[PDB]
Structures are given as C-alpha cells and as structure tokens.
Amino acid sequence: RKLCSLDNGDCDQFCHEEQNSVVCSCARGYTLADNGKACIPTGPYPCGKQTLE
Amino acid sequence: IVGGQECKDGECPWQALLINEENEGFCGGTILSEFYILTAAHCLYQAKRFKVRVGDRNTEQEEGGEAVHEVEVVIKHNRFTKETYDFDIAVLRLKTPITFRMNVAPACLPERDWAESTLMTQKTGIVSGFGRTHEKGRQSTRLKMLEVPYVDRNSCKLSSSFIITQNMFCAGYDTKQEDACQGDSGGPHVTRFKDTYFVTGIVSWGEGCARKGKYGIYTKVTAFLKWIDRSMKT
Ligand SMILES: C[C@@H](C(=O)N1CCOCC1)N1CC[C@H](NS(=O)(=O)/C=C/c2ccc(Cl)cc2)C1=O
Ligand SMILES: [Ca+2]
Ligand SMILES: [Mg+2]
C-alpha cells in the first residue's frame, strides 16, 4: 500500500498519483486548503453534507 | 424501500421525487445542483406530464421545507434501451433554481478513477426513497434510507436471469429482507467518505424486491460522469 492506496494519501476527498507523489483535490464547491489535503466549503449548503440547524 | 429506517431531519437532503398530475410520486431523483436532477431514463415513460418535489420527508403533513419545481428540459441518454435497461440514465433541467435549506442540498459528483478504486470498494452504499415497503405493499408516506452492501460482480451475474452490462452494478442482500422496490427507481445510491456523501448509483431494476438469491441492480454512475458533465452545460 503506497501513496493513494495508503489511507487515501491523507486526502480529504480525491487522491491521484503524479510522478511518484500524492496530489489531493476536492469536489466542485470546495477549495483545497493551504496544507494541500483538506477540502473547505466555499459557500452555504455545500454538496455531500447532511443539513444542520 | 423494504426494511431500513426513516431518514431523520436533514439526513437525506439530496432526495427528489417525480410526481404525476394526481400529485403522486412514481420515481425518485438526486439533486446535483440548483438547476439539475439525476434520474433513470426508464422513469420517463411512466407519466405524460410530471414535476419534481424536494425537501419532503412525510407526504401527509406540511413540514415547511417542501418545494415543487417544473421541468424545462428532459435529457435522456440516446443509447437507452427498454429491452435490457442498458444506459438507464437521464438528467432534468428545472425552470426555476432550487433554494437550498434544511432538507434540501446537493450530493457530490465524484471523479471516476477515485470513486471506482475507493468508494465502490467500501463495504456499503446508501439507497433512499418513498417506494413500496414490500414487493406487493403500498408506497411509503415516509422517506426511507437503507445501507446496502456492494455485491461481488461475478456472484451478481451468476444470480441474474437478465443481462448485467458494463453500465450496471449490484448491491443488497442474498437472503436478508432489505432492498429498494417499485417507486424508488431513479433515486439516489450514495457512498459516504469522511462524512461527505458522493453519488455512486441510480436505482434501476430488480427481479421483484428483496427475493432470496436476487440483488438490486443500479446504473453505474462512474461510467457516465463525462456524459453528466456535458448534459449540465447544455
Ligand atoms: C427484471 C426487471 C425488468 O422487467 N426489466 C426489464 C428489462 O430489462 C431488465 C429489467 N423487473 C422485473 C419486475 C421489476 N419491477 S419492480 O417494480 O419490482 C422494481 C424493483 C426494484 C428492485 C430493486 C432495485 Cl435496486 C430497483 C428496482 C423489474 O425491474
Ligand atoms: Ca410533507
Ligand atoms: Mg436478495
């Protein structure tokens, strides 16, 4: 188990392998955080989240 | 949905219901964005004129979140066929945009390779709807959800009396009494990953509901991601 196959490469969402290195990415409506791993919602009611209130 | 549980407040916000002239649901759908609903192609031959309802969990009370939307454009896959239910997928563009709120939110579209290697290899997915509560029963007045294990592709093929194409996958149980049913077709099959829910399938067909030695068959959304992307731009 290497890179993306090892715990999703530490990525919150999408993981892909480029030139022997993990590159993380996010679904539409999220932006990749400064750490290049976490996904941050850009606005209210982002995709894939159960609603609270 | 045969078996399972009620969707509790805010738990199934991407559910949509296709309703006929009599205001009765006949198929489900998945909210993809403010303008688009994902559903099954075969569902489009079950009513002359229909609308889409969102934010509903109980069809017998006004909860305050319900919204009905008219359909502007129907986008059916041109390779769909009634013989086998191959290419069983459609996208609907709505006349007015959906205002997201409690019980009304979209599910995420995943990327193909990651979804097939990581989501579709998880133990289970979640299916939901207002369909029949047992093969010969009545439709549910309550929105239900159910965890359905991914089923080995070879085992599924061996169990089926009808062809399983490259555009379909199997989920559910061999003998346990839990499955999707009539009325749920067109509805969401989603997979959870780190508290985020991604669209992985569309409720498609089955030999009855929850039969011994039979599974639920779903349209394989990951095979249609570029097609969905195109449909959402025109
Ligand atoms: C076998 C299937 C069927 O008729 N077809 C048409 C030809 O292409 C293959 C599929 N059937 C038999 C009757 C059944 N209808 S239903 O209302 O019971 C649907 C139930 C259902 C169960 C599980 C899932 Cl995941 C989805 C639907 C049906 O579809
Ligand atoms: Ca209601
Ligand atoms: Mg079974």
Alpha-carbon distance B41 to B35, whole Å? 18
Chain A's closest residue to B104, CA to CA, is: A51
| Chain A residues touching B193 at Cβ < 8 A | 13
Alpha-carbon distance B114 to B116, whole Å? 6
- From the alpha carbon of B209, which atom of ligand 1 is closest? 22
Pairing of strands B67-69, B5-6: unpaired
B8 interface with A at CB cutoff 8 Å:
no
CA of B182 to the centre of ligand 1 (A): 8
The listed CATH number (3.30.365.10, 2.10.25.10, 1.10.238.10, 3.40.50.970) that belongs to domain A1-53 = 2.10.25.10
Resolution value in angstroms: 2.1
Q: Which residues contact B123 (CB under 8 A, 6 or more apart)?
A: B149, B150
B30-B35-B37 Cα angle (round to 5): 20
Tokens of B160: 């089926």
**Domain ranges, ordered by start, for chain A:** 1-53
A vs B: CB pairs below 8 A: 65
Enumerate domains of chain B plus CATH numbers.
1-12+107-222 (2.40.10.10), 13-106+223-234 (2.40.10.10)
Q: Which residues contact B116 (CB under 8 A, 6 or more apart)?
A: B222
Q: Is B88 a catalytic residue?
A: yes
Contact in structure between B158 and B169 (CB atoms under 8 Å) = no
Ligand 1 neighbourhood includes B182 CB (under 6 angstroms): yes
Q: Flag if A27 and B198 touch (Cβ within 8 Å).
A: yes
Taking residue B233's Cβ as centre, other Cβ atoms within 10 Å add up to 5
H or E stretch at B227: helix B225-231
Q: Which residues contact A18 (CB under 8 A, 6 or more apart)?
A: none
CA of B38 to the centre of ligand 3 (A): 26
Task: Point out the residue among A14, A28, A45 whose CB comes nearest to the CB of B114.
Answer: A14
